[PDB]
């Protein structure tokens, strides 16, 4: 079984390593597979950011919350989050909701690339053979691979904590 051509060699152990061992790709229209890639990339970007936030919270770089709590916040990111007031947590929820609204109602993502919330596909050309420094597919694969790795890494951090301390 080969890639559904809308993903088209965009992941796996190698770039052309269509890996689905569950039939989550078959008999699915291109819009649904684009949705799957958009969800994967959003989950990734969120993870990749969350891992950095975790490691900068677990390394003592926990200002803005050092001041809010008016005392040194916990290095454990879960306990640090629990220390935050509900006002701050709901401000974070509201800001993420506003961001999600931005990329749906006023700034909808491109139809053929829903993961391109910034709409970067309107200013970049493509990877072409005339370009000696063409790396756009390479950086897309870097983003995807670090996304897939951080998606399991952040879960490792979260479930490792709150169950082992």
């Amino acid at each position: 079984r080969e890639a559904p051509k809308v993903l088209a060699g965009t992941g796996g152990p190698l770039p052309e390593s269509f890996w689905d061992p569950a039939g989550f790709t078959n008999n699915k229209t291109d819009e649904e597979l684009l949705f799957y890639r958009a969800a994967e990339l959003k989950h990734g970007r969120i993870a990749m950011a969350a891992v950095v936030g975790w490691f900068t919270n677990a390394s003592g770089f926990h200002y803005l919350g050092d001041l809010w709590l008016k005392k040194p916040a916990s290095d454990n990111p879960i306990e640090a989050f629990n220390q935050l007031s509900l006002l701050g947590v709901f401000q974070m929820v509201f800001f993420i909701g506003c961001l999600e609204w931005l990329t749906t109602v006023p700034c909808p993502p491109p139809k053929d690339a829903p993961w391109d919330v910034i709409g970067m596909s309107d200013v970049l050309e493509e990877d072409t053979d005339e370009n000696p420094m063409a790396e756009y597919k390479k950086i897309q694969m870097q983003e995807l691979n670090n996304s897939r790795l951080a998606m399991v890494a952040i879960i490792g951090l979260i479930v490792q904590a709150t169950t082992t301390g």
Partner: protein
């Protein structure tokens, strides 16, 4: 032949009637080192560099000679707390008051770090410095007159040059200095700190000395080797050994196969290399200025406060000057290149980069100086709780107060260096950032608007140094990259002056605070800097006017020379104002009247008197401005820190 060509510039000056003016003389001086593009440009550059190395060797030999003959270096060795003086002053006129001049260059601490205990060693070093200067002059002669063209060193042989500098020069010099430390600078300091006499340094290279007296390789030696003046040398030796190892290993583990100067002409390549080299040297000077008081490395250095202040201020000034010269030579290389297509992205984002930097500078200036003026106004209005201070609205630099990290077998520098920062530190650091940003703005604007601009569209045809394009388009004065460097030098002066003021006030505040006594342990604020460096009035009163007592009351004391240099610096600075505010035409007409007076008496000089050109006038004004300001700060700092410390 060669002697005939030595005055060849003057012969060419007098050959043509067009060059029989004083302006020709000033051009001959201004275009002295401006080595024109030719087949021998690289020879000329390398020979000039070697000649400068010889000059610096002459300077080092003179300094060691003064240490040997005109210094109390031995008395300072017997008692480091005494004033280091290395310049005798003869009894001529009436200058006998300042006969011992306390030198603040740190040569005594340096020589002690080198294991020098006898003035005979200083005599030998002076003699070998003269020999090295003679060798450098011989080599410079040879290279200018009989050697390879050197035109391949920046484009073709750049890999060889870079690899040699990485391995041989840098790594082998660091390794040799580590060997010198471990072998004669550590043992001599051990035998001086313990007071057990020092043998000849070569006797330490005997394999029968402490090298094999005990094989223990940690902090344990005869009696009790607990000298903390000695440990910085141990750390320096370890650092040099590690640096030599990493340099040697990484040089062969580096690509180095990327020369960005393929697209530049040889002259522009030389200017760009000079610019980047000046940037590196200037930032290195600033880094050393910070690290000199950040970390103790020389024996009895922190104790000698005038030496610490002088090293910091001098290296800050040199770093600022070289950072400005970096952009100066980048502009020279860009404007003097035929096809400088390499900077295409930045010459096409000209206005974007310049305008964003303009907004950054505007924001930083309004914010920082508005914090200062707001504190001034609130204190004047009797509203101390509305100011920006610790007892008021607190601008605590939170980003400064955190360096915690996983240990992984580390220590010491894992924190804020054990110093707490306050609102005054925040505001003065933002002032520093703003002034640096403004200097960079002027320099980057000069670089970007060097070949063309929205006002004048053929500025590359005008070369690097031109007075203007004319009074048209409303006025186009000071558009040249040279004029941008000219303004950036003023702003560098402002930035570095504020930086050294901040350092000096913080240093004096810390000295006063550690002079609590021993029992006094609530410094509250006190910390005269932290309590008063929040207003412009606070500075003007508690730093300038307060510390000027030492420099203005120095008459009849050994610091009378500092007082006189203070006055002379003010004089030169106002003369600069004369040169900067005025213009060439007026002085030309005045010289016309004076020359009529001359002709009336049959005097009639043929080198026609012409007043300084526009660029020459600006350069003279800038030179006098820098000299006056820097000399005023020099006299003020030295008098204040020598009289009070």
């Amino acid at each position: 032949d060669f002697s005939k060509a030595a005055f060849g510039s003057a012969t060419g000056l007098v050959a043509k009637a067009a060059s029989q003016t004083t302006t020709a003389i000033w051009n001959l001086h201004a275009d002295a080192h401006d080595f024109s593009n030719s087949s021998y440009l690289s020879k000329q550059v390398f020979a000039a560099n070697l000649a400068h190395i010889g000059v610096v060797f002459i300077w080092l030999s003179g300094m060691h000679f003064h240490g040997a003959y005109f210094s109390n270096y031995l008395d300072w060795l017997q008692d480091p707390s005494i004033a280091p003086t290395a310049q005798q002053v003869s009894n001529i006129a009436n200058q006998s008051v300042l006969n011992p001049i306390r030198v603040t260059s740190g040569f005594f601490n340096l020589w002690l770090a080198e294991g020098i205990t006898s003035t005979y060693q200083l005599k030998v070093i002076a003699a070998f410095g003269l020999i090295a200067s003679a060798l450098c002059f011989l080599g410079s002669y040879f290279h200018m007159h009989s050697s390879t063209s050197f035109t391949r060193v920046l484009n073709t042989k750049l890999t060889s040059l870079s690899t040699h500098h990485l391995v041989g020069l840098l790594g082998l010099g660091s390794l040799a200095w580590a060997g010198h430390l471990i072998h004669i600078s550590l043992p001599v300091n051990i035998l001086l700190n313990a007071g057990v006499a020092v043998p000849s340094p070569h006797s330490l290279l005997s394999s029968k000395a402490v090298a094999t007296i005990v094989e223990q390789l940690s902090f344990s030696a005869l009696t009790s080797s607990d000298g903390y003046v000695w440990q910085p040398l141990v750390y320096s030796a370890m650092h040099h050994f590690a640096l030599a190892l990493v340099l040697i290993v990484g040089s062969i583990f580096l690509s180095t196969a990327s020369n960005p100067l393929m697209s530049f002409t040889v002259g522009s390549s030389w200017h760009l290399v000079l610019g980047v080299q000046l940037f590196v040297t200037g930032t290195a000077s600033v880094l050393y200025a910070q690290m000199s008081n950040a970390y103790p490395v020389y024996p009895y250095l922190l104790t000698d406060h005038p030496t610490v202040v002088s090293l910091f201020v001098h290296h800050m000034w040199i770093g600022g000057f070289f950072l400005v010269g970096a952009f100066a030579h980048l502009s020279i290389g860009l404007v003097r290149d035929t096809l400088p297509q390499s900077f295409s992205v930045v010459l096409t984002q000209r206005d974007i980069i310049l305008g964003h930097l303009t907004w950054v500078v505007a924001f930083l200036g309004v914010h920082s100086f508005g914090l200062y003026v707001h504190n001034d106004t609130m204190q004047a209005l009797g509203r101390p709780d509305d100011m920006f201070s610790d007892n008021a609205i607190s601008l605590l630099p939170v980003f400064a107060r955190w360096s915690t990290l996983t240990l992984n077998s580390t220590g010491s520098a894992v924190s804020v260096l054990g110093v707490e920062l306050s609102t005054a530190d925040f505001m003065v650091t933002h002032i520093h950032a703003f002034t640096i940003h403004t200097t960079v703005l002027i320099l980057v604007k000069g670089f970007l608007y060097a070949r063309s601009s929205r006002l004048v569209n053929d500025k590359y045809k005008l070369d690097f140094r031109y007075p203007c394009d004319g009074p048209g388009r409303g006025g186009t004065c000071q558009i040249s990259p040279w004029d941008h460097v000219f303004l950036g030098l003023f702003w560098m002066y402002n930035s570095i002056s504020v930086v050294i003021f901040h350092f000096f006030w913080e240093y004096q505040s810390n000295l006063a605070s550690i002079k609590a006594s021993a029992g006094g342990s609530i410094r509250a604020l006190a910390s005269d800097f932290e309590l008063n460096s929040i207003n412009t009035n606070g500075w003007l009163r508690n730093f300038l006017w307060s510390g000027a007592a030492q420099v203005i009351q120095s008459y009849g004391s050994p610091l009378a020379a500092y007082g006189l240099t203070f006055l002379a610096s003010h004089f030169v600075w106002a003369l600069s104002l004369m040169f900067l505010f005025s213009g060439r035409g007026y002085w030309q007409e005045l010289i016309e009247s004076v020359l009529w007076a001359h002709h009336k008496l049959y005097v009639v000089p043929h080198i026609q008197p012409r007043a300084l050109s526009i660029t020459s006038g600006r350069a003279v004004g800038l030179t006098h401005y820098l000299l006056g300001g820097i000399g005023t700060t020099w006299s003020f700092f030295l008098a204040r820190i020598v009289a009070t410390a």
